[PDB]
PDB file of all heavy atoms in Angstrom:
ATOM      1  N   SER P 168      29.802   9.183  17.053  1.00 62.16           N
ATOM      2  CA  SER P 168      30.694  10.122  17.713  1.00 62.16           C
ATOM      3  C   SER P 168      32.010  10.163  16.955  1.00 62.16           C
ATOM      4  O   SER P 168      32.480   9.123  16.507  1.00 62.16           O
ATOM      5  CB  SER P 168      30.907   9.660  19.152  1.00 62.16           C
ATOM      6  OG  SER P 168      31.806  10.496  19.859  1.00 62.16           O
ATOM      7  N   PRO P 169      32.665  11.325  16.830  1.00 59.46           N
ATOM      8  CA  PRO P 169      32.329  12.621  17.435  1.00 59.46           C
ATOM      9  C   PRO P 169      31.395  13.511  16.576  1.00 59.46           C
ATOM     10  O   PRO P 169      31.055  14.596  17.009  1.00 59.46           O
ATOM     11  CB  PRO P 169      33.699  13.285  17.563  1.00 59.46           C
ATOM     12  CG  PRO P 169      34.443  12.795  16.388  1.00 59.46           C
ATOM     13  CD  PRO P 169      34.001  11.365  16.244  1.00 59.46           C
ATOM     14  N   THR P 170      31.019  13.022  15.407  1.00 61.70           N
ATOM     15  CA  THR P 170      30.158  13.772  14.489  1.00 61.70           C
ATOM     16  C   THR P 170      28.868  12.992  14.270  1.00 61.70           C
ATOM     17  O   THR P 170      28.854  11.932  13.609  1.00 61.70           O
ATOM     18  CB  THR P 170      30.879  14.000  13.145  1.00 61.70           C
ATOM     19  OG1 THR P 170      32.155  14.567  13.402  1.00 61.70           O
ATOM     20  CG2 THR P 170      30.075  14.926  12.252  1.00 61.70           C
ATOM     21  N   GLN P 171      27.797  13.452  14.871  1.00 59.36           N
ATOM     22  CA  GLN P 171      26.501  12.803  14.728  1.00 59.36           C
ATOM     23  C   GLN P 171      26.078  12.735  13.284  1.00 59.36           C
ATOM     24  O   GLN P 171      26.314  13.689  12.536  1.00 59.36           O
ATOM     25  CB  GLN P 171      25.468  13.540  15.591  1.00 59.36           C
ATOM     26  CG  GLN P 171      24.124  12.860  15.724  1.00 59.36           C
ATOM     27  CD  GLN P 171      23.208  13.574  16.691  1.00 59.36           C
ATOM     28  OE1 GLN P 171      22.858  14.735  16.473  1.00 59.36           O
ATOM     29  NE2 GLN P 171      22.843  12.906  17.789  1.00 59.36           N
ATOM     30  N   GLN P 172      25.435  11.645  12.892  1.00 57.41           N
ATOM     31  CA  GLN P 172      25.013  11.396  11.527  1.00 57.41           C
ATOM     32  C   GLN P 172      23.507  11.431  11.375  1.00 57.41           C
ATOM     33  O   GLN P 172      22.749  11.245  12.321  1.00 57.41           O
ATOM     34  CB  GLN P 172      25.551  10.059  11.047  1.00 57.41           C
ATOM     35  CG  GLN P 172      27.094   9.973  11.104  1.00 57.41           C
ATOM     36  CD  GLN P 172      27.758  10.928  10.152  1.00 57.41           C
ATOM     37  OE1 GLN P 172      27.519  10.914   8.964  1.00 57.41           O
ATOM     38  NE2 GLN P 172      28.659  11.762  10.701  1.00 57.41           N
ATOM     39  N   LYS P 173      23.070  11.670  10.128  1.00 59.42           N
ATOM     40  CA  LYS P 173      21.657  11.732   9.797  1.00 59.42           C
ATOM     41  C   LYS P 173      21.053  10.388   9.409  1.00 59.42           C
ATOM     42  O   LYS P 173      21.708   9.539   8.812  1.00 59.42           O
ATOM     43  CB  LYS P 173      21.456  12.709   8.620  1.00 59.42           C
ATOM     44  CG  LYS P 173      21.708  14.156   8.990  1.00 59.42           C
ATOM     45  CD  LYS P 173      21.445  15.082   7.831  1.00 59.42           C
ATOM     46  CE  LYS P 173      21.736  16.520   8.219  1.00 59.42           C
ATOM     47  N   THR P 174      19.774  10.212   9.715  1.00 59.89           N
ATOM     48  CA  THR P 174      19.061   9.028   9.255  1.00 59.89           C
ATOM     49  C   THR P 174      18.869   9.023   7.732  1.00 59.89           C
ATOM     50  O   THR P 174      18.963  10.064   7.057  1.00 59.89           O
ATOM     51  CB  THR P 174      17.675   8.904   9.886  1.00 59.89           C
ATOM     52  OG1 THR P 174      16.832   9.926   9.341  1.00 59.89           O
ATOM     53  CG2 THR P 174      17.726   9.036  11.430  1.00 59.89           C
ATOM     54  N   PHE P 175      18.569   7.847   7.215  1.00 63.24           N
ATOM     55  CA  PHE P 175      18.219   7.686   5.830  1.00 63.24           C
ATOM     56  C   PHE P 175      17.091   8.647   5.415  1.00 63.24           C
ATOM     57  O   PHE P 175      17.151   9.295   4.361  1.00 63.24           O
ATOM     58  CB  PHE P 175      17.807   6.232   5.561  1.00 63.24           C
ATOM     59  CG  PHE P 175      17.343   5.963   4.171  1.00 63.24           C
ATOM     60  CD1 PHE P 175      18.248   5.767   3.144  1.00 63.24           C
ATOM     61  CD2 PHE P 175      15.993   5.898   3.871  1.00 63.24           C
ATOM     62  CE1 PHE P 175      17.813   5.503   1.856  1.00 63.24           C
ATOM     63  CE2 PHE P 175      15.566   5.631   2.571  1.00 63.24           C
ATOM     64  CZ  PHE P 175      16.470   5.445   1.564  1.00 63.24           C
ATOM     65  N   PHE P 176      16.037   8.718   6.233  1.00 62.99           N
ATOM     66  CA  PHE P 176      14.931   9.644   5.921  1.00 62.99           C
ATOM     67  C   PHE P 176      15.370  11.109   5.908  1.00 62.99           C
ATOM     68  O   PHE P 176      15.013  11.856   5.003  1.00 62.99           O
ATOM     69  CB  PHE P 176      13.793   9.404   6.900  1.00 62.99           C
ATOM     70  CG  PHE P 176      12.596  10.308   6.687  1.00 62.99           C
ATOM     71  CD1 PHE P 176      11.963  10.398   5.487  1.00 62.99           C
ATOM     72  CD2 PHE P 176      12.106  11.044   7.750  1.00 62.99           C
ATOM     73  CE1 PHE P 176      10.835  11.245   5.330  1.00 62.99           C
ATOM     74  CE2 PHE P 176      11.036  11.885   7.589  1.00 62.99           C
ATOM     75  CZ  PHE P 176      10.391  11.972   6.397  1.00 62.99           C
ATOM     76  N   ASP P 177      16.120  11.523   6.896  1.00 66.29           N
ATOM     77  CA  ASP P 177      16.580  12.913   6.910  1.00 66.29           C
ATOM     78  C   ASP P 177      17.427  13.190   5.680  1.00 66.29           C
ATOM     79  O   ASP P 177      17.220  14.232   5.029  1.00 66.29           O
ATOM     80  CB  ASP P 177      17.358  13.227   8.167  1.00 66.29           C
ATOM     81  CG  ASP P 177      16.483  13.825   9.260  1.00 66.29           C
ATOM     82  OD1 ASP P 177      15.261  13.938   9.033  1.00 66.29           O
ATOM     83  OD2 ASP P 177      17.020  14.158  10.314  1.00 66.29           O
ATOM     84  N   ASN P 178      18.317  12.296   5.321  1.00 66.38           N
ATOM     85  CA  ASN P 178      19.117  12.514   4.107  1.00 66.38           C
ATOM     86  C   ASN P 178      18.272  12.566   2.830  1.00 66.38           C
ATOM     87  O   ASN P 178      18.563  13.357   1.940  1.00 66.38           O
ATOM     88  CB  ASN P 178      20.179  11.426   3.951  1.00 66.38           C
ATOM     89  CG  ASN P 178      21.375  11.654   4.842  1.00 66.38           C
ATOM     90  OD1 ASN P 178      21.802  12.794   5.069  1.00 66.38           O
ATOM     91  ND2 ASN P 178      21.926  10.546   5.356  1.00 66.38           N
ATOM     92  N   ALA P 179      17.230  11.769   2.759  1.00 67.52           N
ATOM     93  CA  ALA P 179      16.401  11.716   1.591  1.00 67.52           C
ATOM     94  C   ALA P 179      15.403  12.832   1.464  1.00 67.52           C
ATOM     95  O   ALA P 179      14.915  13.114   0.378  1.00 67.52           O
ATOM     96  CB  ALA P 179      15.624  10.384   1.551  1.00 67.52           C
ATOM     97  N   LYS P 180      15.066  13.439   2.579  1.00 62.98           N
ATOM     98  CA  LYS P 180      13.827  14.238   2.719  1.00 62.98           C
ATOM     99  C   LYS P 180      13.691  15.318   1.669  1.00 62.98           C
ATOM    100  O   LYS P 180      12.610  15.521   1.093  1.00 62.98           O
ATOM    101  CB  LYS P 180      13.731  14.842   4.126  1.00 62.98           C
ATOM    102  N   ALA P 181      14.764  16.065   1.411  1.00 62.75           N
ATOM    103  CA  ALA P 181      14.684  17.224   0.528  1.00 62.75           C
ATOM    104  C   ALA P 181      14.418  16.801  -0.917  1.00 62.75           C
ATOM    105  O   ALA P 181      13.876  17.584  -1.709  1.00 62.75           O
ATOM    106  CB  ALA P 181      15.985  18.023   0.615  1.00 62.75           C
ATOM    107  N   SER P 182      14.760  15.563  -1.215  1.00 62.63           N
ATOM    108  CA  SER P 182      14.595  15.045  -2.596  1.00 62.63           C
ATOM    109  C   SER P 182      13.226  14.410  -2.792  1.00 62.63           C
ATOM    110  O   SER P 182      12.810  14.207  -3.937  1.00 62.63           O
ATOM    111  CB  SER P 182      15.686  13.978  -2.900  1.00 62.63           C
ATOM    112  OG  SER P 182      16.960  14.565  -2.822  1.00 62.63           O
ATOM    113  N   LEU P 183      12.556  14.051  -1.714  1.00 61.66           N
ATOM    114  CA  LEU P 183      11.258  13.404  -1.813  1.00 61.66           C
ATOM    115  C   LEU P 183      10.168  14.308  -2.367  1.00 61.66           C
ATOM    116  O   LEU P 183      10.178  15.524  -2.160  1.00 61.66           O
ATOM    117  CB  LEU P 183      10.822  12.921  -0.443  1.00 61.66           C
ATOM    118  CG  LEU P 183      11.713  11.842   0.184  1.00 61.66           C
ATOM    119  CD1 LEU P 183      11.218  11.509   1.582  1.00 61.66           C
ATOM    120  CD2 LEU P 183      11.721  10.584  -0.665  1.00 61.66           C
ATOM    121  N   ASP P 184       9.203  13.711  -3.055  1.00 63.78           N
ATOM    122  CA  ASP P 184       8.069  14.514  -3.553  1.00 63.78           C
ATOM    123  C   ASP P 184       7.321  15.204  -2.412  1.00 63.78           C
ATOM    124  O   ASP P 184       6.878  16.353  -2.557  1.00 63.78           O
ATOM    125  CB  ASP P 184       7.074  13.615  -4.302  1.00 63.78           C
ATOM    126  CG  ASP P 184       7.638  13.085  -5.633  1.00 63.78           C
ATOM    127  OD1 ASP P 184       8.778  13.439  -6.008  1.00 63.78           O
ATOM    128  OD2 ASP P 184       6.920  12.313  -6.301  1.00 63.78           O
ATOM    129  N   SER P 185       7.188  14.514  -1.260  1.00 64.87           N
ATOM    130  CA  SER P 185       6.614  15.079  -0.044  1.00 64.87           C
ATOM    131  C   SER P 185       7.460  14.525   1.095  1.00 64.87           C
ATOM    132  O   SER P 185       7.917  13.396   1.046  1.00 64.87           O
ATOM    133  CB  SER P 185       5.152  14.615   0.076  1.00 64.87           C
ATOM    134  OG  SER P 185       4.513  15.125   1.241  1.00 64.87           O
ATOM    135  N   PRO P 186       7.692  15.324   2.163  1.00 67.68           N
ATOM    136  CA  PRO P 186       8.655  14.938   3.197  1.00 67.68           C
ATOM    137  C   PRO P 186       8.041  13.971   4.225  1.00 67.68           C
ATOM    138  O   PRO P 186       7.907  14.308   5.423  1.00 67.68           O
ATOM    139  CB  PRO P 186       9.038  16.285   3.820  1.00 67.68           C
ATOM    140  CG  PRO P 186       7.801  17.100   3.707  1.00 67.68           C
ATOM    141  CD  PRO P 186       7.207  16.720   2.350  1.00 67.68           C
ATOM    142  N   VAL P 187       7.662  12.803   3.765  1.00 67.88           N
ATOM    143  CA  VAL P 187       6.899  11.858   4.583  1.00 67.88           C
ATOM    144  C   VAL P 187       7.391  10.418   4.302  1.00 67.88           C
ATOM    145  O   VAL P 187       7.955  10.136   3.234  1.00 67.88           O
ATOM    146  CB  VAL P 187       5.396  11.896   4.255  1.00 67.88           C
ATOM    147  CG1 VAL P 187       4.849  13.306   4.410  1.00 67.88           C
ATOM    148  CG2 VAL P 187       5.093  11.382   2.830  1.00 67.88           C
ATOM    149  N   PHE P 188       7.149   9.531   5.260  1.00 69.46           N
ATOM    150  CA  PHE P 188       7.156   8.117   4.985  1.00 69.46           C
ATOM    151  C   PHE P 188       5.960   7.487   5.655  1.00 69.46           C
ATOM    152  O   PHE P 188       5.402   8.093   6.584  1.00 69.46           O
ATOM    153  CB  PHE P 188       8.487   7.431   5.347  1.00 69.46           C
ATOM    154  CG  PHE P 188       8.770   7.366   6.827  1.00 69.46           C
ATOM    155  CD1 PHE P 188       8.384   6.256   7.603  1.00 69.46           C
ATOM    156  CD2 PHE P 188       9.495   8.361   7.473  1.00 69.46           C
ATOM    157  CE1 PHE P 188       8.666   6.205   8.950  1.00 69.46           C
ATOM    158  CE2 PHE P 188       9.799   8.297   8.813  1.00 69.46           C
ATOM    159  CZ  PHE P 188       9.368   7.208   9.554  1.00 69.46           C
ATOM    160  N   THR P 189       5.556   6.325   5.181  1.00 70.70           N
ATOM    161  CA  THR P 189       4.396   5.649   5.739  1.00 70.70           C
ATOM    162  C   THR P 189       4.733   4.193   6.059  1.00 70.70           C
ATOM    163  O   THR P 189       5.530   3.553   5.393  1.00 70.70           O
ATOM    164  CB  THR P 189       3.152   5.701   4.783  1.00 70.70           C
ATOM    165  OG1 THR P 189       3.417   4.981   3.557  1.00 70.70           O
ATOM    166  CG2 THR P 189       2.832   7.128   4.413  1.00 70.70           C
ATOM    167  N   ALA P 190       4.123   3.728   7.161  1.00 68.80           N
ATOM    168  CA  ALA P 190       4.231   2.350   7.600  1.00 68.80           C
ATOM    169  C   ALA P 190       2.858   1.688   7.474  1.00 68.80           C
ATOM    170  O   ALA P 190       1.906   2.164   8.086  1.00 68.80           O
ATOM    171  CB  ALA P 190       4.705   2.263   9.016  1.00 68.80           C
ATOM    172  N   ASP P 191       2.847   0.576   6.761  1.00 66.85           N
ATOM    173  CA  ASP P 191       1.626  -0.212   6.565  1.00 66.85           C
ATOM    174  C   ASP P 191       1.980  -1.669   6.871  1.00 66.85           C
ATOM    175  O   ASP P 191       2.209  -2.458   5.939  1.00 66.85           O
ATOM    176  CB  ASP P 191       1.146  -0.020   5.108  1.00 66.85           C
ATOM    177  CG  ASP P 191      -0.124  -0.744   4.771  1.00 66.85           C
ATOM    178  OD1 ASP P 191      -0.773  -1.332   5.670  1.00 66.85           O
ATOM    179  OD2 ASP P 191      -0.447  -0.740   3.567  1.00 66.85           O
ATOM    180  N   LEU P 192       2.040  -2.006   8.144  1.00 63.29           N
ATOM    181  CA  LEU P 192       2.467  -3.331   8.581  1.00 63.29           C
ATOM    182  C   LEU P 192       1.320  -4.296   8.507  1.00 63.29           C
ATOM    183  O   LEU P 192       0.165  -3.964   8.867  1.00 63.29           O
ATOM    184  CB  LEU P 192       3.000  -3.240   9.997  1.00 63.29           C
ATOM    185  CG  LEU P 192       4.164  -2.287  10.273  1.00 63.29           C
ATOM    186  CD1 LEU P 192       4.531  -2.347  11.731  1.00 63.29           C
ATOM    187  CD2 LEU P 192       5.381  -2.620   9.408  1.00 63.29           C
ATOM    188  N   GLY P 193       1.609  -5.531   8.100  1.00 63.23           N
ATOM    189  CA  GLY P 193       0.596  -6.558   8.000  1.00 63.23           C
ATOM    190  C   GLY P 193       0.476  -7.400   9.265  1.00 63.23           C
ATOM    191  O   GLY P 193       1.414  -7.584   9.999  1.00 63.23           O
ATOM    192  N   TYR P 194      -0.718  -7.922   9.475  1.00 61.56           N
ATOM    193  CA  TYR P 194      -0.931  -8.967  10.478  1.00 61.56           C
ATOM    194  C   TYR P 194      -0.718 -10.302   9.835  1.00 61.56           C
ATOM    195  O   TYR P 194      -1.475 -10.712   8.940  1.00 61.56           O
ATOM    196  CB  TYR P 194      -2.349  -8.853  11.060  1.00 61.56           C
ATOM    197  CG  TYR P 194      -2.768 -10.031  11.903  1.00 61.56           C
ATOM    198  CD1 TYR P 194      -2.140 -10.349  13.100  1.00 61.56           C
ATOM    199  CD2 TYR P 194      -3.782 -10.901  11.460  1.00 61.56           C
ATOM    200  CE1 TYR P 194      -2.534 -11.438  13.881  1.00 61.56           C
ATOM    201  CE2 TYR P 194      -4.147 -11.997  12.191  1.00 61.56           C
ATOM    202  CZ  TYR P 194      -3.541 -12.262  13.409  1.00 61.56           C
ATOM    203  OH  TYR P 194      -3.888 -13.359  14.163  1.00 61.56           O
ATOM    204  N   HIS P 195       0.318 -11.002  10.294  1.00 63.92           N
ATOM    205  CA  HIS P 195       0.691 -12.312   9.770  1.00 63.92           C
ATOM    206  C   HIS P 195       0.772 -12.252   8.228  1.00 63.92           C
ATOM    207  O   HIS P 195       0.384 -13.207   7.561  1.00 63.92           O
ATOM    208  CB  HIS P 195      -0.333 -13.389  10.246  1.00 63.92           C
ATOM    209  CG  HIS P 195      -0.309 -13.677  11.729  1.00 63.92           C
ATOM    210  ND1 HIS P 195       0.513 -13.062  12.644  1.00 63.92           N
ATOM    211  CD2 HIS P 195      -1.084 -14.531  12.447  1.00 63.92           C
ATOM    212  CE1 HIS P 195       0.269 -13.559  13.849  1.00 63.92           C
ATOM    213  NE2 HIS P 195      -0.697 -14.441  13.743  1.00 63.92           N
ATOM    214  N   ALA P 196       1.298 -11.175   7.693  1.00 64.83           N
ATOM    215  CA  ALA P 196       1.338 -10.953   6.253  1.00 64.83           C
ATOM    216  C   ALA P 196       2.320  -9.833   5.947  1.00 64.83           C
ATOM    217  O   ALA P 196       2.573  -9.018   6.810  1.00 64.83           O
ATOM    218  CB  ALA P 196      -0.047 -10.563   5.700  1.00 64.83           C
ATOM    219  N   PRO P 197       2.841  -9.783   4.715  1.00 60.03           N
ATOM    220  CA  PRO P 197       3.689  -8.634   4.333  1.00 60.03           C
ATOM    221  C   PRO P 197       2.915  -7.306   4.305  1.00 60.03           C
ATOM    222  O   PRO P 197       1.701  -7.284   4.221  1.00 60.03           O
ATOM    223  CB  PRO P 197       4.191  -9.015   2.939  1.00 60.03           C
ATOM    224  CG  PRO P 197       4.052 -10.508   2.900  1.00 60.03           C
ATOM    225  CD  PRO P 197       2.790 -10.800   3.649  1.00 60.03           C
ATOM    226  N   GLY P 198       3.681  -6.216   4.353  1.00 59.86           N
ATOM    227  CA  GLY P 198       3.152  -4.874   4.290  1.00 59.86           C
ATOM    228  C   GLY P 198       4.122  -4.020   3.522  1.00 59.86           C
ATOM    229  O   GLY P 198       4.953  -4.545   2.748  1.00 59.86           O
ATOM    230  N   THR P 199       4.067  -2.719   3.710  1.00 59.29           N
ATOM    231  CA  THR P 199       4.781  -1.745   2.899  1.00 59.29           C
ATOM    232  C   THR P 199       5.302  -0.564   3.667  1.00 59.29           C
ATOM    233  O   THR P 199       4.580  -0.011   4.500  1.00 59.29           O
ATOM    234  CB  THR P 199       3.841  -1.231   1.771  1.00 59.29           C
ATOM    235  OG1 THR P 199       3.290  -2.348   1.060  1.00 59.29           O
ATOM    236  CG2 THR P 199       4.590  -0.305   0.813  1.00 59.29           C
ATOM    237  N   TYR P 200       6.543  -0.165   3.369  1.00 57.54           N
ATOM    238  CA  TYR P 200       7.064   1.133   3.720  1.00 57.54           C
ATOM    239  C   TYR P 200       7.191   1.965   2.456  1.00 57.54           C
ATOM    240  O   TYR P 200       7.866   1.546   1.504  1.00 57.54           O
ATOM    241  CB  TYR P 200       8.461   1.050   4.394  1.00 57.54           C
ATOM    242  CG  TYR P 200       8.423   0.636   5.829  1.00 57.54           C
ATOM    243  CD1 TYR P 200       8.765  -0.646   6.226  1.00 57.54           C
ATOM    244  CD2 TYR P 200       8.110   1.567   6.819  1.00 57.54           C
ATOM    245  CE1 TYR P 200       8.742  -1.043   7.565  1.00 57.54           C
ATOM    246  CE2 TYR P 200       8.091   1.193   8.147  1.00 57.54           C
ATOM    247  CZ  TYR P 200       8.410  -0.088   8.519  1.00 57.54           C
ATOM    248  OH  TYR P 200       8.366  -0.427   9.869  1.00 57.54           O
ATOM    249  N   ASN P 201       6.556   3.140   2.440  1.00 55.69           N
ATOM    250  CA  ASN P 201       6.674   4.088   1.335  1.00 55.69           C
ATOM    251  C   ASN P 201       7.373   5.338   1.788  1.00 55.69           C
ATOM    252  O   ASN P 201       7.169   5.797   2.932  1.00 55.69           O
ATOM    253  CB  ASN P 201       5.299   4.450   0.789  1.00 55.69           C
ATOM    254  CG  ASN P 201       4.649   3.304   0.046  1.00 55.69           C
ATOM    255  OD1 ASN P 201       5.336   2.473  -0.520  1.00 55.69           O
ATOM    256  ND2 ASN P 201       3.325   3.295   0.039  1.00 55.69           N
ATOM    257  N   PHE P 202       8.151   5.901   0.897  1.00 56.15           N
ATOM    258  CA  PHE P 202       8.870   7.158   1.127  1.00 56.15           C
ATOM    259  C   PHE P 202       8.443   8.173   0.069  1.00 56.15           C
ATOM    260  O   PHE P 202       8.542   7.911  -1.134  1.00 56.15           O
ATOM    261  CB  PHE P 202      10.389   6.963   1.079  1.00 56.15           C
ATOM    262  CG  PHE P 202      10.889   6.133   2.235  1.00 56.15           C
ATOM    263  CD1 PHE P 202      10.827   4.762   2.187  1.00 56.15           C
ATOM    264  CD2 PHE P 202      11.394   6.738   3.387  1.00 56.15           C
ATOM    265  CE1 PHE P 202      11.273   3.971   3.233  1.00 56.15           C
ATOM    266  CE2 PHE P 202      11.805   5.971   4.443  1.00 56.15           C
ATOM    267  CZ  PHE P 202      11.771   4.592   4.371  1.00 56.15           C
ATOM    268  N   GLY P 203       7.975   9.358   0.532  1.00 58.13           N
ATOM    269  CA  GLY P 203       7.786  10.468  -0.358  1.00 58.13           C
ATOM    270  C   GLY P 203       6.384  10.624  -0.907  1.00 58.13           C
ATOM    271  O   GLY P 203       6.150  11.615  -1.636  1.00 58.13           O
ATOM    272  N   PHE P 204       5.477   9.735  -0.571  1.00 55.37           N
ATOM    273  CA  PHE P 204       4.097   9.818  -1.066  1.00 55.37           C
ATOM    274  C   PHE P 204       3.170   9.040  -0.149  1.00 55.37           C
ATOM    275  O   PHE P 204       3.603   8.112   0.543  1.00 55.37           O
ATOM    276  CB  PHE P 204       3.958   9.305  -2.515  1.00 55.37           C
ATOM    277  CG  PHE P 204       4.100   7.796  -2.635  1.00 55.37           C
ATOM    278  CD1 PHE P 204       2.963   7.022  -2.881  1.00 55.37           C
ATOM    279  CD2 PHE P 204       5.309   7.184  -2.552  1.00 55.37           C
ATOM    280  CE1 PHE P 204       3.076   5.652  -3.009  1.00 55.37           C
ATOM    281  CE2 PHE P 204       5.419   5.808  -2.675  1.00 55.37           C
ATOM    282  CZ  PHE P 204       4.304   5.047  -2.905  1.00 55.37           C
ATOM    283  N   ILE P 205       1.901   9.422  -0.197  1.00 57.90           N
ATOM    284  CA  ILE P 205       0.839   8.730   0.531  1.00 57.90           C
ATOM    285  C   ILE P 205      -0.008   7.954  -0.488  1.00 57.90           C
ATOM    286  O   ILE P 205      -0.585   8.560  -1.415  1.00 57.90           O
ATOM    287  CB  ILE P 205       0.034   9.731   1.369  1.00 57.90           C
ATOM    288  CG1 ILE P 205       0.896  10.172   2.596  1.00 57.90           C
ATOM    289  CG2 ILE P 205      -1.263   9.121   1.850  1.00 57.90           C
ATOM    290  CD1 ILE P 205       0.451  11.453   3.253  1.00 57.90           C
ATOM    291  N   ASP P 206      -0.054   6.640  -0.343  1.00 59.15           N
ATOM    292  CA  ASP P 206      -0.842   5.780  -1.213  1.00 59.15           C
ATOM    293  C   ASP P 206      -2.291   5.816  -0.749  1.00 59.15           C
ATOM    294  O   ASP P 206      -2.650   5.149   0.216  1.00 59.15           O
ATOM    295  CB  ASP P 206      -0.283   4.352  -1.197  1.00 59.15           C
ATOM    296  CG  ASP P 206      -1.043   3.383  -2.088  1.00 59.15           C
ATOM    297  OD1 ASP P 206      -2.073   3.812  -2.701  1.00 59.15           O
ATOM    298  OD2 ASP P 206      -0.656   2.199  -2.136  1.00 59.15           O
ATOM    299  N   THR P 207      -3.125   6.567  -1.475  1.00 59.94           N
ATOM    300  CA  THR P 207      -4.499   6.764  -1.065  1.00 59.94           C
ATOM    301  C   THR P 207      -5.358   5.519  -1.290  1.00 59.94           C
ATOM    302  O   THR P 207      -6.532   5.522  -0.845  1.00 59.94           O
ATOM    303  CB  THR P 207      -5.152   7.971  -1.820  1.00 59.94           C
ATOM    304  OG1 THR P 207      -5.144   7.723  -3.215  1.00 59.94           O
ATOM    305  CG2 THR P 207      -4.343   9.260  -1.515  1.00 59.94           C
ATOM    306  N   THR P 208      -4.824   4.490  -1.910  1.00 59.34           N
ATOM    307  CA  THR P 208      -5.523   3.224  -2.046  1.00 59.34           C
ATOM    308  C   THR P 208      -5.251   2.269  -0.883  1.00 59.34           C
ATOM    309  O   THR P 208      -5.844   1.186  -0.804  1.00 59.34           O
ATOM    310  CB  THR P 208      -5.201   2.467  -3.348  1.00 59.34           C
ATOM    311  OG1 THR P 208      -3.879   1.907  -3.296  1.00 59.34           O
ATOM    312  CG2 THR P 208      -5.308   3.420  -4.553  1.00 59.34           C
ATOM    313  N   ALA P 209      -4.364   2.648   0.050  1.00 60.52           N
ATOM    314  CA  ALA P 209      -3.894   1.731   1.076  1.00 60.52           C
ATOM    315  C   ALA P 209      -4.662   1.821   2.404  1.00 60.52           C
ATOM    316  O   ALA P 209      -4.325   1.078   3.336  1.00 60.52           O
ATOM    317  CB  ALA P 209      -2.389   1.940   1.315  1.00 60.52           C
ATOM    318  N   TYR P 210      -5.660   2.686   2.478  1.00 63.48           N
ATOM    319  CA  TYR P 210      -6.400   2.847   3.722  1.00 63.48           C
ATOM    320  C   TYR P 210      -7.847   3.154   3.405  1.00 63.48           C
ATOM    321  O   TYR P 210      -8.196   3.494   2.282  1.00 63.48           O
ATOM    322  CB  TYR P 210      -5.802   3.952   4.608  1.00 63.48           C
ATOM    323  CG  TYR P 210      -5.711   5.314   3.912  1.00 63.48           C
ATOM    324  CD1 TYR P 210      -6.773   6.208   3.940  1.00 63.48           C
ATOM    325  CD2 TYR P 210      -4.564   5.675   3.222  1.00 63.48           C
ATOM    326  CE1 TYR P 210      -6.675   7.436   3.298  1.00 63.48           C
ATOM    327  CE2 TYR P 210      -4.452   6.893   2.589  1.00 63.48           C
ATOM    328  CZ  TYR P 210      -5.517   7.750   2.619  1.00 63.48           C
ATOM    329  OH  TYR P 210      -5.392   8.985   1.968  1.00 63.48           O
ATOM    330  N   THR P 211      -8.696   3.032   4.410  1.00 64.68           N
ATOM    331  CA  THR P 211     -10.112   3.337   4.287  1.00 64.68           C
ATOM    332  C   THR P 211     -10.378   4.654   5.021  1.00 64.68           C
ATOM    333  O   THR P 211      -9.592   5.034   5.895  1.00 64.68           O
ATOM    334  CB  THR P 211     -11.008   2.234   4.899  1.00 64.68           C
ATOM    335  OG1 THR P 211     -10.726   2.111   6.290  1.00 64.68           O
ATOM    336  CG2 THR P 211     -10.744   0.896   4.215  1.00 64.68           C
ATOM    337  N   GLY P 212     -11.466   5.322   4.661  1.00 61.97           N
ATOM    338  CA  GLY P 212     -11.815   6.559   5.323  1.00 61.97           C
ATOM    339  C   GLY P 212     -10.755   7.605   5.170  1.00 61.97           C
ATOM    340  O   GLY P 212     -10.094   7.713   4.131  1.00 61.97           O
TER     341      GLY P 212
END
């Protein structure tokens, strides 16, 4: 306040290769946040 601000993703979005981010959280292990692309090796089906 008094001027609402944008999130990191909203600020980045226009510059990204694709306007997306992905969450790949691990069970009892590290994982990955990606911005601007979908890693097609990171999922099945």
